[PDB]
Amino acid sequence: HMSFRDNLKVYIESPESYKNVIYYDDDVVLVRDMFPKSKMHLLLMTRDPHLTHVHPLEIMMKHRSLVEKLVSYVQGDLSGLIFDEARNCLSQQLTNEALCNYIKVGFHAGPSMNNLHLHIMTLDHVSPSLKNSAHYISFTSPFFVKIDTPTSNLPTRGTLTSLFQEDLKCWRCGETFGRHFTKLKAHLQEEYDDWLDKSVSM
Ligand SMILES: [Zn+2]
Numbered sequence: 001h002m003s004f005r006d007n008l009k010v011y012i013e014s015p016e017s018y019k020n021v022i023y024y025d026d027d028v029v030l031v032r033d034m035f036p037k038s039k040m041h042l043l044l045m046t047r048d049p050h051l052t053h054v055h056p057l058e059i060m061m062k063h064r065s066l067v068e069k070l071v072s073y074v075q076g077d078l079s080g081l082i083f084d085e086a087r088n089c090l091s092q093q094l095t096n097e098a099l100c101n102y103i104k105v106g107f108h109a110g111p112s113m114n115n116l117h118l119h120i121m122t123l124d125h126v127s128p129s130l131k132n133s134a135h136y137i138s139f140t141s142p143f144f145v146k147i148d149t150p151t152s153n154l155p156t157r158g159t160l161t162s163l164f165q166e167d168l169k170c171w172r173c174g175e176t177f178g179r180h181f182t183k184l185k186a187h188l189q190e191e192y193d194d195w196l197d198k199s200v201s202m
Pocket residue numbers: 170171172173174175187191
């Protein structure tokens with residue numbers, strides 16, 4: 001397991017060693033992504049050696065126990081922690097109320113790291129580390145498998161390549177930008193400021 005794709009393995013082996021880790025116990029580790037693709041971008045990782053290397057699509061289909069445990073952490077145990085993190089990344093003026101509708105949770109259909117990781121992130125996609133269409137698309141299309149996706153609605157592996165070829169479009173308003181990733185980025189910034197302006201008075 002010496003591929004760079006195995007680099008997450010350190011967080012579940014020795015979570016006590018990394019400042020990036022904001023919660024762990026015997027079962028899971030909540031860690032900040034080192035290349036955040038939104039203002040807040042966290043990963044929830046199982047520490048189970050027999051689950052960490054299972055593909056997320058096989059997890060969704062055949063490991064509901066784990067799915068339910070992860071959800072219980074996100075929506076229960078760690079909810080307050082995640083909202084506080086969001087306030088640190090966005091604005092302290094934001095309520096859990098407003099943040100709840102500004103966060104998404106799910107797996108990549110074709111992860112790039114080998115250890116199972118659930119993405120927990122704000123919707124903005126305003127971040128320096130979002131650098132190409134593939135990044136953006138991987139979070140705003142069916143390639144992002146929302147944790148509440150029914151098994152019957154899981155994406156087909158074969159058809160996954162075609163998503164990354166399509167014009168860029170804003171997730172919030174649907175405006176398209178062709179392949180002008182740079183124009184998309186400027187617009188995402190505009191969308192975030194708008195959401196933030198509306199939301200801080202609430
Ligand atoms: Zn828009």
